[PDB]
RNA sequence: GGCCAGCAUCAGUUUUGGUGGCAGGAUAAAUCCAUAGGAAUGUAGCUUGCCUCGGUAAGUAUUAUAGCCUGUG
RNA sequence: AGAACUGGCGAUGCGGGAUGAACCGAACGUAGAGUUAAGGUGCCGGAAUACACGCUCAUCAGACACCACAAAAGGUGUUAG
RNA sequence: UUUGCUCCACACAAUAUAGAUGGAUACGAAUAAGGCGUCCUUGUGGCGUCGCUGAACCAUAGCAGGCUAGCAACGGUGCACUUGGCGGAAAGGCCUUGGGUGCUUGCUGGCGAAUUGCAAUGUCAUUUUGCGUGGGGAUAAAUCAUUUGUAUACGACUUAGA
């Protein structure tokens, strides 16, 4: 008989929270939240990923579950220094999310022939799995 | 102007364990248990420890924020209710016709039955709400007593009686007749 | 896309559900709509009750037959919303409508078929949280509809059978996953990883 | 195998029109899976057949075809304008229609 | 009225025999193109000096760029505006990253809260509130508190096709 | 060479993309680098009061075991 | 009901204002292609259920010039001064 | 009333089509919260994990897909049969048993394709009906006229008649 209260554990807008951008010249790139402007705007910066330090509307960006030590209002060079230090990229890269992204980018690059080979393999994989799923 | 967050606390005493999934609240203490459904509200509960629970509103307006406190109150009265309990007292009040009050049972139900009121031949009835019990207060004249773990079921069963006893067609000032709620408190004494 | 699209009414906003259904018809897409009683309308129950009585009083003064007809059933409150979004006095209009079917509940065929949703009419995506809304079933039963209880009954019964269907299915895909795994790390599997599979 | 389709599915939507006046010389086609004018810039030029059936056999078949081509993109969501050899019948609004891959550019 | 730029404008009364080299006056003007800017300039000058455009000249127009466009700033703003029954002075504070963005939302806010269109407003001052604790309007102090964080509850992701096969979720 | 088409090379009109070279401005403003000064939504350190073995807070303290701001180059 | 100047209707279709002599756009040989006006783009209905910042919840909300009405006076609803 | 009707089978003819062209691919509930996996004290429980769209999943190679051989598997699938069971909201469909039989592109062989001439939907769906044959099965009634009056302007209604 301890108490037990749900949670509901949201990603936060906060300095050091990394977001993936969805509109515009950048888009598909990560960046860090430096300052926060209001409930609608924040100041982002993503030097490794190429994206310009800028103001940006939250609804244009999606908050990843990643955070890292960043002083509020830190300039680009500092943001580069910390980011690297925290190895956020490899961390992101390792997530299901980023993998899901890369998977479908790859599907969309397949040559028509490659596409043909994907089928031949699925036939092959299907043959032995169907067996498996049949014996115990 | 939208407040970026305001929050409230809900203290938890040594006998009780509140528990809340979705926004469906259950408080279980020494005197039984009640549950209450906050789904209509949009707050966020948070355990901090076995004696502390925060309730908060993010990016809320006035009417929103202004519902934060009443959430706190409602769950609080569940916690007090499940510990100390609630006791509403009512006295009868009449100027000549003695109002005569008793508890009847048809098809197993328990009704408060009020006869003679202001002379009236008609016989008044109020049901007993489940969870509220009714003692005709001995040692005190024309006092009725409604107890229970839910403030809301006692306070309402109270008000039902007092409203079955409204006076029509008279100067309601001069004719002050009725059954009135005369003191609100707890069951467990010293507290 | 498919020959038939079955839409789960539940959680949708009447006039938005109507507005998209209309277009789809007109463009050749057959549609059946289900659980039309679990449809929503913005505005608290009383508002749409008052609106409904407004509608309720228009009638041909000399002959209340010829006048405007008032269907009380949820599917049909719906159909009304829809029909007004379709040029129903033209042949092309009649045509599009025949591609439509609306149902309170989920009766045979469709209960074993899959149903979809329409995000641009999904209340829980659209209504500002806080705003009050109305459920069709409750609205209709207060203006005459007779069959909320019997639908509720049939649904709860349907809902049981389908909970089994599911449980079975979940059981079987658990196996399927366990197979598709006793076969990961094999050559063919690694090969497909490379190609995005 | 089971698929032999060498075209993209499509839909006879309206004629080109105002509120109150249509122009049967231009038809408006919704091309399955094309959502933006950029997306549809691809099909500009592709040829379109509306394939239909009749009771009198003719050059051998009971199947006739109206031929046309995509000509510009129309509006913001991948709808496309097209002209046909003869304007399409208007009972066809909502009928399917076939878009090909020729003339090719890949 | 648009997306703004801020301009230094400089003008003077036309020269004369007896008064060559007249005094020279400057305004910072918030407009969207230089053509509106110059016009705006003469609008206020004649609210101040004996001049019309007819008898005076523009000497220089230059766009002023924000000094630190990726630094957040707490703006104090002063405005004169006309209502349906009176005219009024007013002070709001805006929090953004350039004066030029600031003026954009001001104009918005005025139109939204007070139904004031562009014709009816006069920006008096726009200046950086150097040290906090001279920030005064609460809807801004709100965003200065230390180690600030907040969720964005009830996520609505935008569907890209009319039907969906799931059922969404507003988690976030 | 009657009827209708496909492609190629062009001409007139038009529509929708890719991409190369330049000009202007505070010879953009920023970022970046250097440098001087600064403060706080005060980073290390220090102090003191509770406190399950160091965590909290309220002091001190301006680069320290984070950083930012402002000017000049 | 009666004057002043211009522009119109009458004598004039065409696009818009659902509808309408006079408003808005624009004045007409037969046609192809392009672009626009005024006015629009949830669906009826061609055209973004487009972007952006606020505001508003009405037990008779509101929704676009001409135009198809509302006033003094009030509100501890809410917003910004 | 000149051999009529019905269900099943193919056959010929017509006829038409609001618009096949790989697959409508089944929990429920919540959204200020959930799905899935796992453990357990089976609970408003512990731990793990996922979302950020179906950009999926499934299917998909062979004369529009011909004729053939082998191997590895014991798997998949089509078809007609047969076992047990489920579904009444419009169930008219779902699951299960067992033998049969075809196909298998799971892998490895032999043969074929041209001249439809550089494109021309290049015809592969499913609707209703008509008429022969022959494999099952079935063997009425309504109306007019007559009649009743619980009915009636006329029709209609309501009775009665081997
Ligand atoms: Mg009275
Ligand atoms: Mg009296
Ligand atoms: Mg500046
Ligand atoms: Mg020709
Ligand atoms: Mg040319
Ligand atoms: Mg260039
Ligand atoms: Mg730091
Ligand atoms: Mg510096
Ligand atoms: Mg005349
Ligand atoms: Mg005219
Ligand atoms: Mg017109
Ligand atoms: Mg009008
Ligand atoms: Mg209509
Ligand atoms: Mg349209
Ligand atoms: Mg757009
Ligand atoms: Mg006006
Ligand atoms: Mg007033
Ligand atoms: Mg007010
Ligand atoms: Mg037809
Ligand atoms: Mg979970
Ligand atoms: Mg589970
Ligand atoms: Mg759990
Ligand atoms: Mg899937
Ligand atoms: Mg084959
Ligand atoms: Mg049906
Ligand atoms: Mg072979
Ligand atoms: Mg026969």
Swiss-Prot record, chain A:
Its main location: cytoplasm. It is found in: Cytoplasm. Pfam families: KOW (PF00467), Ribosomal_L14e (PF01929). GO terms for cellular component: cytosol; cytosolic large ribosomal subunit; nucleolus. CDD domains: eL14. GO terms for molecular function: RNA binding; structural constituent of ribosome. It comes from the Eukaryota. SUPFAM superfamilies: Translation proteins SH3-like domain (SSF50104). One of its GO terms (biological process) is ribosomal large subunit assembly. Keywords: Acetylation, Cytoplasm, Ribonucleoprotein, Ribosomal protein. N-terminally acetylated by acetyltransferase NatA. InterPro entries: KOW, Rib_uL2_dom2, Ribosomal_eL14, Ribosomal_eL14_dom, Translation_prot_SH3-like_sf. Present with 45300 molecules/cell in log phase SD medium. There are 2 genes for eL14 in yeast. Component of the ribosome, a large ribonucleoprotein complex responsible for the synthesis of proteins in the cell. The small ribosomal subunit (SSU) binds messenger RNAs (mRNAs) and translates the encoded message by selecting cognate aminoacyl-transfer RNA (tRNA) molecules. The large subunit (LSU) contains the ribosomal catalytic site termed the peptidyl transferase center (PTC), which catalyzes the formation of peptide bonds, thereby polymerizing the amino acids delivered by tRNAs into a polypeptide chain. Belongs to the eukaryotic ribosomal protein eL14 family. This is Large ribosomal subunit protein eL14A. It comes from Saccharomyces cerevisiae (strain ATCC 204508 / S288c) (Baker's yeast). The gene is RPL14A.
Swiss-Prot record, chain B:
One of its GO terms (molecular function) is structural constituent of ribosome. GO terms for cellular component: cytosol; cytosolic large ribosomal subunit. One of its GO terms (biological process) is cytoplasmic translation. InterPro entries: Ribosomal_uL6-like, Ribosomal_uL6-like_a/b-dom_sf, Ribosomal_uL6_a/b-dom, Ribosomal_uL6_CS2. PROSITE patterns: RIBOSOMAL_L6_2 (PS00700). Pfam families: Ribosomal_L6. It is found in: Cytoplasm. SUPFAM superfamilies: Ribosomal protein L6. Gene3D superfamilies: Ribosomal protein L6, alpha-beta domain (3.90.930.12). Keywords: Cytoplasm, Ribonucleoprotein, Ribosomal protein. Component of the large ribosomal subunit (LSU). Mature yeast ribosomes consist of a small (40S) and a large (60S) subunit. The 40S small subunit contains 1 molecule of ribosomal RNA (18S rRNA) and 33 different proteins (encoded by 57 genes). The large 60S subunit contains 3 rRNA molecules (25S, 5.8S and 5S rRNA) and 46 different proteins (encoded by 81 genes). uL6 lines the binding pocket for eukaryotic elongation factor 2 (eEF2). Present with 52400 molecules/cell in log phase SD medium. There are 2 genes for uL6 in yeast. Belongs to the universal ribosomal protein uL6 family. This is Large ribosomal subunit protein uL6A.
From Swiss-Prot, chain C:
The keyword Thylakoid does not apply. GO terms for cellular component: cytosol; cytosolic large ribosomal subunit; nucleolus; ribosome. Keywords: Acetylation, Cytoplasm, Isopeptide bond, Ribonucleoprotein, Ribosomal protein, Ubl conjugation. The keyword Oxidoreductase does not apply. Its main location: cytoplasm. There is a cross-link at residue 175 (Glycyl lysine isopeptide (Lys-Gly) (interchain with G-Cter in ubiquitin)). GO terms for biological process: cytoplasmic translation; maturation of LSU-rRNA; negative regulation of translation. Pfam families: Ribosomal_L13. One of its GO terms (molecular function) is RNA binding. It is found in: Cytoplasm. N-terminally acetylated by acetyltransferase NatA. InterPro entries: Ribosomal_uL13, Ribosomal_uL13_CS, Ribosomal_uL13_euk/arc, Ribosomal_uL13_sf. Disulfide bonds: none annotated. Component of the ribosome, a large ribonucleoprotein complex responsible for the synthesis of proteins in the cell. The small ribosomal subunit (SSU) binds messenger RNAs (mRNAs) and translates the encoded message by selecting cognate aminoacyl-transfer RNA (tRNA) molecules. The large subunit (LSU) contains the ribosomal catalytic site termed the peptidyl transferase center (PTC), which catalyzes the formation of peptide bonds, thereby polymerizing the amino acids delivered by tRNAs into a polypeptide chain. NCBIfam families: L13_A_E (TIGR01077). Present with 43300 molecules/cell in log phase SD medium. There are 2 genes for uL13 in yeast. Belongs to the universal ribosomal protein uL13 family. HAMAP family: Ribosomal_uL13. This is Large ribosomal subunit protein uL13A. It comes from Saccharomyces cerevisiae (strain ATCC 204508 / S288c) (Baker's yeast).
From Swiss-Prot, chain E:
The modification Phosphoserine is found at residue 32. GO terms for biological process: cytoplasmic translation. The keyword Transmembrane helix does not apply. Pfam families: Ribosomal_L18A. InterPro entries: Ribosomal_eL20, Ribosomal_eL20_dom, Ribosomal_eL20_eukaryotes. One of its GO terms (cellular component) is cytosolic large ribosomal subunit. SUPFAM superfamilies: RplX-like (SSF160374). It comes from the Eukaryota. One of its GO terms (molecular function) is structural constituent of ribosome. The keyword Transmembrane helix does not apply. Component of the ribosome, a large ribonucleoprotein complex responsible for the synthesis of proteins in the cell. The small ribosomal subunit (SSU) binds messenger RNAs (mRNAs) and translates the encoded message by selecting cognate aminoacyl-transfer RNA (tRNA) molecules. The large subunit (LSU) contains the ribosomal catalytic site termed the peptidyl transferase center (PTC), which catalyzes the formation of peptide bonds, thereby polymerizing the amino acids delivered by tRNAs into a polypeptide chain. Present with 54300 molecules/cell in log phase SD medium. This is Large ribosomal subunit protein eL20A. It comes from Saccharomyces cerevisiae (strain ATCC 204508 / S288c). The gene is RPL20A.
């Amino acid at each position: 008989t301890d108490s037990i209260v749900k949670a509901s554990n949201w990603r936060l807008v906060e300095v050091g929270r990394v977001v993936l951008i969805k509109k515009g010249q950048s888009a598909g790139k990560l960046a860090a939240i430096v300052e926060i402007i209001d409930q609608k705007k924040v100041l982002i910066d993503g030097p490794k990923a190429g994206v310009p330090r800028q103001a940006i509307n939250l609804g244009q960006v999606v908050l990843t579950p990643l955070t890292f030590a960043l002083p509020r209002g830190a300039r680009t060079a500092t943001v580069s220094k910390k980011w690297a230090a925290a190895a956020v990229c490899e961390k992101w890269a390792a997530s299901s999310w980023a993998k899901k992204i890369a998977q479908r980018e790859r599907r969309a690059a397949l040559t028509d022939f490659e596409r043909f080979q994907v089928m031949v393999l699925r036939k092959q994989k299907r043959y032995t799995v169907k067996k498996a799923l049949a014996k115990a | 102007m939208k407040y970026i967050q305001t929050e409230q606390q809900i203290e938890v005493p040594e006998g009780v364990t509140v528990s809340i999934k979705s926004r469906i609240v259950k408080v279980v203490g020494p005197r039984g248990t009640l549950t209450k459904n906050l789904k209509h509200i949009d707050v966020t509960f948070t355990k901090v420890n076995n004696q502390l629970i925060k309730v908060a509103v993010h990016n809320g307006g006035r009417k929103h924020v202004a519902a934060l406190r009443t959430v706190k109150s409602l769950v609080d009265n569940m916690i007090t209710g499940v510990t100390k309990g609630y006791k509403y007292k009512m006295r009868y009040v009449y100027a000549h016709f003695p109002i005569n009050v008793n508890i009847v049972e048809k098809d197993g139900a328990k009704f408060i039955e009020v006869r003679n009121f202001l002379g009236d031949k008609k016989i008044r009835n109020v049901p007993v709400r489940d969870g509220v019990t009714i003692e005709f207060s001995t040692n005190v004249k024309d006092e009725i007593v409604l107890s229970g773990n839910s403030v809301e079921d006692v306070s309402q069963n109270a008000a039902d009686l007092q409203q079955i006893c409204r006076v029509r067609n008279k100067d309601i000032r001069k004719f002050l007749d009725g059954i009135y709620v005369s003191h609100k408190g707890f069951i467990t004494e010293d507290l | 896309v498919e020959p038939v699209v079955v839409i789960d009414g539940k959680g949708h906003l009447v006039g938005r559900l109507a507005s998209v259904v209309a277009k789809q018809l007109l463009n050749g897409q057959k549609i059946v709509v289900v659980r039309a009683e679990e449809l929503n309308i913005s505005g608290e129950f009383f508002r749409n009750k008052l609106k409904y009585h407004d509608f309720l009083r228009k009638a041909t003064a000399f002959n209340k037959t010829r006048g405007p007809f008032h269907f009380r059933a949820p599917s049909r409150i719906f159909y009304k919303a829809l029909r007004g979004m379709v040029s129903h006095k033209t042949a092309r209009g009649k045509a599009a409508l025949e591609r439509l079917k609306v149902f309170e509940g989920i009766p045979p065929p469709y209960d074993k078929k899959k149903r979809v949703v329409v995000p641009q009419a999904l209340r829980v995506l659209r209504l500002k949280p806080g705003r009050k809304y109305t459920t069709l079933g409750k609205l209709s039963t207060s203006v005459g509809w007779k069959y909320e209880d019997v639908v509720a009954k049939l649904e709860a019964k349907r809902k049981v059978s389908s909970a089994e269907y599911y449980a079975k299915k979940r059981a079987f895909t658990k196996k399927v996953a366990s197979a598709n795994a006793t076969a990961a790390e094999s050559d063919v599997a690694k090969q497909l990883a490379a190609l995005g599979y | 195998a089971e698929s032999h389709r060498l075209y993209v599915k499509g839909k006879h939507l309206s004629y080109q029109r105002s509120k109150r006046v249509n122009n049967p010389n231009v038809s408006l086609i919704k091309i399955e899976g094309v959502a933006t004018p950029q997306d549809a810039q691809f099909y500009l030029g592709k040829r379109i057949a509306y394939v239909y059936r009749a009771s009198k056999e003719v050059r051998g078949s009971k199947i006739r075809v109206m031929w046309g081509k995509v000509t510009r993109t129309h509006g913001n969501s991948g709808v496309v304008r097209a002209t046909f050899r003869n304007n399409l019948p208007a009972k066809t609004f909502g009928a399917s229609v076939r878009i090909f891959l020729y003339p090719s550019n890949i | 009225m648009a997306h703004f730029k801020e301009y230094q404008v400089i003008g003077r009364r036309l020269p004369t025999e007896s008064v060559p080299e007249p005094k020279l006056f400057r305004m910072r003007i918030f407009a969207s193109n230089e053509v509106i800017a110059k016009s705006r300039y003469w609008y206020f000058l004649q609210k101040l000096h004996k001049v019309k455009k007819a008898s005076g000249e523009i000497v220089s127009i230059n766009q002023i760029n924000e000094a630190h466009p990726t630094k957040v700033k707490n703006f104090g703003v002063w405005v004169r505006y006309d209502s349906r029954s009176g005219t009024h002075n007013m002070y709001k504070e805006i929090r953004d990253v350039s004066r030029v963005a600031a003026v954009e939302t001001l104009y918005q806010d005025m139109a939204a809260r007070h139904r004031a269109r562009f014709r009816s407003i006069h920006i008096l001052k726009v200046a950086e509130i150097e040290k906090t604790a001279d920030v005064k309007r609460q809807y801004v102090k709100q965003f200065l508190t230390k180690d600030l964080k907040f969720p964005l509850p009830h996520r609505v992701q935008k569907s890209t096709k009319t039907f969906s096969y799931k059922r969404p979720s507003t988690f976030y």
